[PDB]
Each structure stands twice: as C-alpha cells, then as structure tokens.
Design an enzyme around this catalytic site. Sequence first.
Site, short mmCIF file in Angstrom:
data_model
loop_
_atom_site.label_atom_id
_atom_site.label_comp_id
_atom_site.label_asym_id
_atom_site.label_seq_id
_atom_site.Cartn_x
_atom_site.Cartn_y
_atom_site.Cartn_z
N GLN A 123 -1.82 -0.57 3.55
CA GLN A 123 -3.18 0.13 3.25
C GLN A 123 -4.22 -1.07 3.07
N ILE B 109 -5.42 -5.37 1.41
CA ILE B 109 -4.92 -6.59 0.57
C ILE B 109 -5.18 -6.27 -0.94
CG2 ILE B 109 -5.06 -9.11 0.63
CD1 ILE B 109 -6.88 -6.98 3.21
N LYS C 162 -8.21 -3.80 -4.50
CA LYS C 162 -7.47 -3.39 -3.21
C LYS C 162 -8.79 -3.30 -2.27
CE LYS C 162 -3.80 -0.66 -2.41
NZ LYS C 162 -2.92 0.41 -2.14
N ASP D 199 7.56 9.57 -1.25
CA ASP D 199 7.99 8.40 -1.00
C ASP D 199 7.81 7.32 -1.98
OD1 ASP D 199 8.54 6.43 0.91
OD2 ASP D 199 6.54 5.74 1.39
N1 LIG Z 1 -2.75 -1.96 -10.32
C1 LIG Z 1 -1.64 -3.09 -9.96
N2 LIG Z 1 -1.14 -3.85 -11.08
C2 LIG Z 1 -0.45 -4.72 -10.70
N3 LIG Z 1 0.16 -4.88 -9.53
C3 LIG Z 1 -0.45 -4.17 -8.51
C4 LIG Z 1 -1.45 -3.17 -8.78
N4 LIG Z 1 -1.52 -2.70 -7.45
C5 LIG Z 1 -0.99 -3.35 -6.54
N5 LIG Z 1 -0.01 -4.14 -7.17
C6 LIG Z 1 0.94 -4.91 -6.37
O1 LIG Z 1 0.96 -4.86 -5.05
C7 LIG Z 1 1.98 -4.67 -4.66
C8 LIG Z 1 2.11 -3.82 -3.41
O2 LIG Z 1 0.61 -3.41 -3.04
P1 LIG Z 1 0.29 -1.73 -2.99
O3 LIG Z 1 -0.90 -1.71 -3.95
O4 LIG Z 1 1.51 -0.89 -3.01
O5 LIG Z 1 -0.37 -1.39 -1.63
P2 LIG Z 1 -0.18 -1.88 -0.04
O6 LIG Z 1 0.75 -3.21 -0.21
O7 LIG Z 1 -1.43 -2.02 0.50
N6 LIG Z 1 0.54 -0.67 0.52
P3 LIG Z 1 2.32 -0.75 0.22
O8 LIG Z 1 2.88 -1.91 0.05
O9 LIG Z 1 2.94 0.39 1.40
O10 LIG Z 1 2.43 0.09 -1.05
C9 LIG Z 1 2.93 -3.90 -5.73
O11 LIG Z 1 4.49 -4.14 -5.51
C10 LIG Z 1 2.28 -4.58 -6.75
O12 LIG Z 1 3.23 -5.72 -7.21
MG LIG Z 2 1.16 1.28 -1.93
#
Ligand SMILES: Nc1ncnc2c1ncn2[C@@H]1O[C@H](COP(=O)(O)OP(=O)(O)NP(=O)(O)O)[C@@H](O)[C@H]1O
Ligand SMILES: [Mg+2]
EC number: 2.7.11.24
Length: 359
Positions: free
Chosen positions: A33, A35, A51, A147
């Site tokens: 998605q 960083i 994000k 998922d």
């Molecule tokens: N609001 C939040 N509060 C705390 N940790 C967060 C938060 N959003 C994301 N994270 C951390 O980021 C990790 C993975 O990022 P995420 O938000 O899932 O998006 P992504 O890595 O871009 N896509 P994906 O890994 O496929 O889910 C999570 O396991 C958390 O550890």
């Molecule tokens: Mg995610």
Amino acid sequence: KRDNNFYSVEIGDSTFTVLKRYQNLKPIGSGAQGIVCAAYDAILERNVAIKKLSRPFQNQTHAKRAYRELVLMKCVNHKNIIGLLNVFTPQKSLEEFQDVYIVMELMDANLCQVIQMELDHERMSYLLYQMLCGIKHLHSAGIIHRDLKPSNIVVKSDCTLKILDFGLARTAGTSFMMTPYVVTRYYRAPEVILGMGYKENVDIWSVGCIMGEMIKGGVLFPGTDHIDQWNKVIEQLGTPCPEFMKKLQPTVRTYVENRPKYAGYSFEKLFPDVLFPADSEHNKLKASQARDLLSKMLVIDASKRISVDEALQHPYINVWYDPSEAEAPPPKIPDKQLDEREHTIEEWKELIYKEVMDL
Ligand SMILES: Nc1ncnc2c1ncn2[C@@H]1O[C@H](COP(=O)(O)OP(=O)(O)NP(=O)(O)O)[C@@H](O)[C@H]1O
Ligand SMILES: [Mg+2]
Ligand SMILES: *[C@@H]1[C@@H](C(=O)OC(C)(C)C)C(=O)[C@@H]2C[C@@]1(C(=O)OC)CC2=C
C-alpha cells in the site's frame, strides 16, 4: 502557489511531504500500500501514524483499494475499526495531484506482538470479542474482509483492538496480482485459497486461525506456498467431505481429490491443556470452551462453519457482550456504487482527489 504549510523529509528511499504540524517522522511500516511513519502531531498533541499512498489512481487495482479505504475510514466510527484523524495531499491541483497521506491514531502494538505474550483466557476472549465486533460492524454494511491477519490488527495500551484494513473487496482471491511484495496467506479461508464462492463467515476462518495461534504461539497453517498451505490444513483438520469437493473447478478438484486422505486430529490433540491456563476449575472449563469455539470456526466447509453472530453468543466470548459495541448502527456508506464501479485512470484520479477534498 507555494503553500508554506508543508515540508519534506526523506524516509528511506521515498520522500514524505507533510503538513508542518507533523513532526519527527519515523518509519514504522512498509508494504504494497505504501510507507507508514510514526509522527508527533503538534496541533492534536499526540502521536499519529501517517501512511503515504503514491499515485493511487495509477491503475484500477490500486485505485479501487485506495478509494474504498478512504471512503470507509471516513464513514466508519467504531471502537474496533481504525479511525481517520486527517487526510491531505501536498499537491495543490487535480493536474498536479500525485500522493495521498492518511493520518491515523498511532496504536502501541500489532496483534503479532500481542500474540507473543502469554495471554490468559480473559485477555484472549476479550481480544477475540473485539475482533468479532469489528468484523460484525463491517458485515452490517456489506463489507466482507476476506484477508484478516494479525499484522493488520493493532492494539492500544488500554486494550482496545482495532482492525487496520478493509480487505479484498470484490476481487478474485486467486487472480494474478502485479506486486513486488510478499502476500501473507496463512489466515485466508479454504474458499479463498481454492477460488470458491464465499459468504460472511469467510472471516470466521481467519479469526479461528488467529485464536489458534494465540494459544499455540505459532502460525497454525504456515504454508511456504499455495501447495503447502492446503496440505497443512488437511493434515491437521482432515480431508473435507465429497459434497465440498463437488464445488471445485476441475484442475483444483483433481489435485484436492488426489491428495492422501487425512482423518485430521481432535481439537484436544491439536490444542492440549498444556498450552492453556489450566490451574483451576474455571480455567479447565475455559479450555474446553475454547476448543469448542475453535472446532466451530476452523471448519473447512463454510456451510458447516459458525457465523459471526453465533461466535459472539458462544460462552467463551459472550462474557464480554455489550450491545453498544456488538449491535452498533451499520456504517452509512455515501457512495452507493462502492466496489461496483469501473473507471478510467483520469476518472479514478478525480474521484480520489475529491475524496481527499470532500468535493
Ligand atoms: N495506525 C497505526 N498504528 C500503529 N501501527 C500501525 C498503524 N498503521 C500501520 N501500522 C504498522 O504498519 C504495519 C503494516 O502497515 P499497514 O498499515 O498494514 O500497510 P502496508 O504495510 O502499506 N500494507 P500491508 O502490509 O499489506 O498491510 C502494521 O503491522 C503496523 O505495525
Ligand atoms: Mg495493511
Ligand atoms: C487488557 C487486555 C489485553 O489484552 O491486554 C494486552 C496488554 C493487549 C495483552 C484485555 O484483553 C482485557 C482488558 C485488559 C485491561 O487491562 O483492561 C483495562 C485485561 C483484559 C482481560
């Protein structure tokens, strides 16, 4: 015109351009998605997660996921679904629009980390209850996740659990996905990984996988690939009935039918008392109740698998039941064609731009 309200900081390879209120950005996550950075919000006086979605309109696959996560994060307000604190784009025009920044509450841990701790029955049942409440809330607006996984479930120091994402929408869970990143498949229901029809309790399988992991301390079905994943399920739970087999497409069906025939193991053998708190009368009964719930969620054939509502009523879970969380009014999704639209790149760019602008 230059808007003095933004600044730029380099996080690893990519650059974040954020409102000046967001200070001290630190990378906490990455994936398909975008960083994710932790930051201090000087206006709210609290920590937040930011994000960055890079060019989310670049193709429909990206656009549909970004759009629906924006819409849903904005219109859902529930204890067990991650909230939206802010959203912005640094670019000033539709023509220049590139990136979207999502600002969320910064939670203290993901569920992977929480799983590592020794959790008594009260903590396991409370976390499961909350997962079920969040899933029930999504389902009430017609959103089936498909998922769910511990890395996308986060927890606060006050024990509030929140689901981070909104799942696979109306895509095929066994269609090609152009992406460089690993995709974790350990928690996906049989009907997802075998490319079958599904209903709401597809998400119950995932809850069962998480519950079993909470107890055992390791992933239940850690398949090194699609082949291995199925093998690990049948080895433990048994080969499913012929009636289920008749649902499968020819190539999948021949494969599944020509695997060795497994009886499966009892839930007592899969989840022995040694793995549980079991030093007392309350705790021994609770272990049996836990195995009873697992035995109803970890059911290959979804037609015999328990529903979310039935799980919420199960004696292991229902000690926590509060209709304020378990019977909340459904989200009102303003976009009546959510997940039913095909758009050009420029149409998706404008839809996502407006979503950011509420225009
Ligand atoms: N609001 C939040 N509060 C705390 N940790 C967060 C938060 N959003 C994301 N994270 C951390 O980021 C990790 C993975 O990022 P995420 O938000 O899932 O998006 P992504 O890595 O871009 N896509 P994906 O890994 O496929 O889910 C999570 O396991 C958390 O550890
Ligand atoms: Mg995610
Ligand atoms: C906290 C949690 C719990 O899971 O805590 C962590 C730290 C995440 C393991 C529960 O599941 C409920 C609520 C509890 C608490 O301290 O609430 C104030 C204990 C409990 C049983």
